[PDB]
Design a protein around this motif. Structure first.
Motif, PDB file in Angstrom:
ATOM      1  N   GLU A  81       0.825  -1.211   0.000  1.00 33.98           N
ATOM      2  CA  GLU A  81       0.000   0.000   0.000  1.00 33.98           C
ATOM      3  C   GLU A  81       0.862   1.264   0.000  1.00 33.98           C
ATOM      4  O   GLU A  81       0.505   2.275  -0.617  1.00 33.98           O
ATOM      5  N   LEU A  82       2.010   1.206   0.667  1.00 35.66           N
ATOM      6  CA  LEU A  82       2.896   2.376   0.708  1.00 35.66           C
ATOM      7  C   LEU A  82       3.554   2.661  -0.636  1.00 35.66           C
ATOM      8  O   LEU A  82       3.660   3.818  -1.048  1.00 35.66           O
ATOM      9  N   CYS A  83       4.025   1.615  -1.307  1.00 34.74           N
ATOM     10  CA  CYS A  83       4.588   1.783  -2.646  1.00 34.74           C
ATOM     11  C   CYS A  83       3.519   2.242  -3.633  1.00 34.74           C
ATOM     12  O   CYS A  83       3.772   3.101  -4.477  1.00 34.74           O
ATOM     13  N   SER A  84       2.314   1.694  -3.523  1.00 33.46           N
ATOM     14  CA  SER A  84       1.213   2.226  -4.330  1.00 33.46           C
ATOM     15  C   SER A  84       1.033   3.725  -4.107  1.00 33.46           C
ATOM     16  O   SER A  84       0.891   4.495  -5.065  1.00 33.46           O
ATOM     17  N   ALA A  85       1.029   4.144  -2.845  1.00 31.91           N
ATOM     18  CA  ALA A  85       0.794   5.553  -2.529  1.00 31.91           C
ATOM     19  C   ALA A  85       1.948   6.432  -3.025  1.00 31.91           C
ATOM     20  O   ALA A  85       1.726   7.517  -3.570  1.00 31.91           O
ATOM     21  N   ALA A  86       3.177   5.956  -2.846  1.00 32.40           N
ATOM     22  CA  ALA A  86       4.361   6.722  -3.258  1.00 32.40           C
ATOM     23  C   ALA A  86       4.412   6.920  -4.775  1.00 32.40           C
ATOM     24  O   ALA A  86       4.697   8.016  -5.257  1.00 32.40           O
ATOM     25  N   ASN A 134       4.208  11.800  -0.083  1.00 30.17           N
ATOM     26  CA  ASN A 134       5.517  12.075   0.524  1.00 30.17           C
ATOM     27  C   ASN A 134       5.815  11.302   1.799  1.00 30.17           C
ATOM     28  O   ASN A 134       6.923  10.823   1.979  1.00 30.17           O
ATOM     29  N   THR A 135       4.848  11.211   2.706  1.00 30.32           N
ATOM     30  CA  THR A 135       5.062  10.408   3.917  1.00 30.32           C
ATOM     31  C   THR A 135       5.293   8.939   3.570  1.00 30.32           C
ATOM     32  O   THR A 135       6.167   8.278   4.141  1.00 30.32           O
ATOM     33  N   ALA A 136       4.509   8.421   2.633  1.00 30.15           N
ATOM     34  CA  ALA A 136       4.712   7.045   2.177  1.00 30.15           C
ATOM     35  C   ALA A 136       6.167   6.795   1.758  1.00 30.15           C
ATOM     36  O   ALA A 136       6.754   5.773   2.097  1.00 30.15           O
ATOM     37  N   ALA A 137       6.748   7.732   1.025  1.00 32.96           N
ATOM     38  CA  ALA A 137       8.139   7.604   0.582  1.00 32.96           C
ATOM     39  C   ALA A 137       9.116   7.606   1.753  1.00 32.96           C
ATOM     40  O   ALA A 137      10.022   6.783   1.822  1.00 32.96           O
TER      41      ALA A 137
END
Length: 263
Positions: free
Chosen positions: A96-101, A107-110
């Motif tokens: 989910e974080l890579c999807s968001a990034a 930015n927070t995801a990255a």
């Protein structure tokens, strides 16, 4: 095609700023056209593709799991975090974080993902180990977008970035499953409408990641091709311009129209 270099130089004139450009054949890895190929430009959010590349390399090696959940603190939140702002309570998985990034440029995801690998210095070590000895990430979001003239922090060269993307998408570097996921995320890019996508005919495939920063910095990396299949890599960066966001977008889209026209 030489006509596209004419347009690239025209963009440089209109923006009053350097433009770096690579068109790369996806299969052979050979440069089809180039402009300022070994000059440094700020990566801005284009680095997020390389970041998830490093994450997927860890997944391949069994050092990371896409399903692993990370709960994080409101203290981790930085400007422009449209997905991560919404999951303080439930947390987010690595997937989910890579999807968001990548798809949303969160930015927070990255930053959370950088943390999982050991920070910017470790992304840089990953790049060196895959044969990119020039691209470097030094800072976190949002400082990495500062784009101070002549600062080499958080920069790449168009030629290196094109080769690196090709290796991530089609190399042996990542397993097929990881290559498939990485390109899927880029295809699902939601925030690059006004750039190459605005010049892309229906039926064409595109997987991309855009970036914007201080001092007029703007850029995009992409794999694209007709008939629903990617066959070329395009890398465009610019920095230094005082032009508006719309004008910078337009110049990049016009470069895109030219490479499509002379495809």
């Amino acid at each position: 095609h030489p006509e596209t270099l004419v347009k690239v130089k025209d963009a440089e004139d209109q923006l009053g700023a350097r433009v770096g450009y690579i068109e790369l054949d996806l299969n052979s890895g050979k440069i089809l056209e180039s402009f300022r190929p070994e000059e440094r430009f700020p990566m801005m959010s284009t680095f997020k593709v390389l970041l998830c590349g490093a994450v997927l390399s860890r997944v391949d090696a069994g050092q990371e799991q896409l399903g692993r959940r990370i709960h994080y603190s409101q203290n981790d939140l930085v400007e422009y975090s449209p997905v991560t702002e919404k999951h303080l309570t439930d947390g987010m998985t690595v997937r989910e974080l890579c999807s968001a990034a990548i798809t949303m440029s969160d930015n927070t995801a990255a930053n959370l993902l950088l943390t999982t690998i050991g920070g910017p210095k470790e992304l840089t070590a990953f790049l060196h180990n895959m044969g990119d000895h020039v691209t470097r990430l030094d800072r976190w979001e949002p400082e990495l977008n500062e784009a101070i003239p002549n600062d080499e922090r958080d920069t790449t060269m168009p030629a290196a970035m094109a080769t690196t993307l090709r290796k991530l998408l089609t190399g042996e570097l990542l397993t097929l499953a990881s290559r498939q996921q990485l390109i899927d995320w880029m295809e699902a890019d939601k925030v690059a409408g006004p750039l190459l996508r605005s010049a892309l005919p229906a039926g064409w495939f595109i997987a991309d990641k855009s970036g914007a920063g201080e001092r007029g910095s703007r850029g995009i990396i992409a794999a694209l091709g007709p008939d629903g299949k990617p066959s070329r890599i395009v890398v465009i960066y610019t920095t230094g311009s005082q032009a508006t966001m719309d004008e910078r977008n337009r110049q990049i889209a016009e470069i895109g129209a030219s490479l499509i026209k002379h495809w």
